[PDB]
């Protein structure tokens, strides 16, 4: 008996792709691309910070401009996503048989 | 104060600044070792 049809009114949305850029957190992290990371043994981030200065009068007891070298250590992590296929579909995706 | 904001799209990239200088040759004067370096530097630019 059974007969099928598809309404055009709406569409169910199977799970929706979410970019990470569109979210709020994206602010907190500037994100760049290592073409490779894991090959690194250890790494660091190097940058300079002057110390600000305030001029004063009077016989100058002390001061001199100051730099800093701040270096902080990368932390390697990783994400894992499982995926599976039976042989039922492999032939189809493959091609002709012997 | 507002609803629709702007967001960056493309990720930040990186550039190689400095490297070990390592080359070779198969013996062409003896300066070509030098000239080949500038060659192999001119690539990275």
């Amino acid at each position: 008996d059974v007969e099928f049809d598809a309404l055009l009114g709406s569409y169910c949305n199977t799970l929706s792709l979410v970019r990470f850029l569109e979210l709020g957190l994206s602010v907190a992290c500037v994100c760049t691309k290592f073409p490779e990371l894991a090959y690194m043994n250890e790494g660091r981030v190097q940058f300079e910070v002057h110390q600000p200065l305030i001029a004063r009068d009077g016989p100058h007891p002390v001061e001199q401009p100051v730099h800093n070298y701040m270096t902080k250590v990368i932390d390697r992590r990783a994400l894992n996503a499982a995926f599976s296929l039976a042989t039922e579909a492999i032939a189809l995706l493959t091609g002709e048989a012997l | 104060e507002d609803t629709e904001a702007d967001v960056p799209v493309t990720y930040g990239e990186m550039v190689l600044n400095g490297a070990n200088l390592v080359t070779a040759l198969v013996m062409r004067s003896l300066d070509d070792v030098g000239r080949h370096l500038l060659e192999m530097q001119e690539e990275q630019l």
Partner: peptide, 30 residues
């Protein structure tokens, strides 16, 4: 058929330190 490899000199300098006082972290390489 000999192979020639350029000698490599590795040294690091902090020229700006002379221009100004600095207090760099020990671990980091200036």
């Amino acid at each position: 058929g000999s192979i020639l490899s350029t000698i490599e000199v590795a040294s690091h300098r902090r020229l700006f330190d002379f221009f100004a006082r600095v207090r760099s972290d020990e671990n980091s390489l200036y």
